[PDB]
Amino acid sequence: MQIFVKTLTGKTITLEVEPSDTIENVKAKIQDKEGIPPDQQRLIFAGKQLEDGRTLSDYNIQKESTLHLVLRLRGG
Amino acid sequence: MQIFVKTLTGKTITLEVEPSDTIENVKAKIQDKEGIPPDQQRLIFAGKQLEDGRTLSDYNIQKESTLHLVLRL
Contacting residues of B for A53, CB less than 8 Å apart: 42, 70, 72-73
Other beta carbons less than 10 A from residue B61's beta carbon? 23
- B5: amino acid identity, one letter: V
Torsion region of B28: left, alpha or beta (phi above 0 gives left; psi -120 to 50 gives alpha): alpha
Contacting residues of A for B54, CB less than 8 Å apart: 39, 76
User: Where in chain A are the domains?
Assistant: 1-76
Torsion sign over Cα A42, B45, B28, B36: negative
Say which DSSP state B17 is in: -
Which of A38, A53, A75 minimises the CB distance to B60? A75
Torsion sign over Cα A14, A17, A21, A25: negative
Q: How far apart are CA B66 and CA B61, in angstroms?
A: 9
**CA neighbours within 13 Å on the CB side: how many for B15?**
28
Q: What is the resolution of this structure in A?
A: 2.4
Q: Does domain A1-76 have CATH number 2.60.40.1220?
A: no
Q: How far apart are CA A75 and CA B56, in angstroms?
A: 13
Torsion region of B48: left, alpha or beta (phi above 0 gives left; psi -120 to 50 gives alpha): beta
Q: Are B47 and B70 in contact (CB under 8 A)?
A: no
Q: For A37-72, give the secondary structure using H, E and C.
A: CHHHEEEEECCEECCCCCECHHHCCCCCCEEEEEEC
- B25: amino acid identity, one letter: N
Say which DSSP state B22 is in: B
Q: How far apart are CA A72 and CA B40, in angstroms?
A: 25
Q: Are B11 and B2 in contact (CB under 8 A)?
A: no
Torsion region of B35: left, alpha or beta (phi above 0 gives left; psi -120 to 50 gives alpha): left
Mutation test of the interface with chain B: which of A31, A52, A73, A74, choosing the one with the most B Cβ atoms within 10 A? A52
Q: How far apart are CA B17 and CA A4, in angstroms?
A: 41
State which fold the B1-73 domain adopts.
Answer: Ubiquitin-like (UB roll) (3.10.20)
Report which secondary-structure segment, H or E, holds A20.
none
Contacting residues of B for A39, CB less than 8 Å apart: 48-51, 54
- Experimental technique used? X-ray
Please indicate whether, in this complex, the C-beta atoms of A39 and B60 are within 8 angstroms of each other.
Answer: no
